[PDB]
Amino acid sequence: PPPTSPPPSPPPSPPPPRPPPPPPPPPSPPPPNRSPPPPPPASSAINP
């Protein structure tokens, strides 16, 4: 007699998930303001 009909192919395995990425570094801080403003020479007396 002929052999029994083979059974159909079985389903494939489930896939794994993916992790999330870490937070990026903060922006570099700005440098301080460019020098002090020119100072006043000062004047008058301030006397009594």
Partner: protein, 49 residues
């Protein structure tokens, strides 16, 4: 014409010291000199900076 004086006006009666931020190293001086850069004058009348 008449050998008489006139027009005399008196000078400064008071020492009138050198104001703040202003010094005078030299005596017998009419004006007050500003203190140089880098040095300070804390009180009025300072001989030097």
């Amino acid at each position: 014409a008449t050998l008489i004086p006139t027009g005399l006006v008196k000078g400064a009666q008071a020492p009138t010291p050198c104001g703040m931020g202003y010094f005078q190293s030299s005596a017998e001086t009419t004006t007050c000199t500003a203190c140089a850069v880098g040095t300070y004058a804390d009180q009025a009348g300072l001989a030097a900076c």
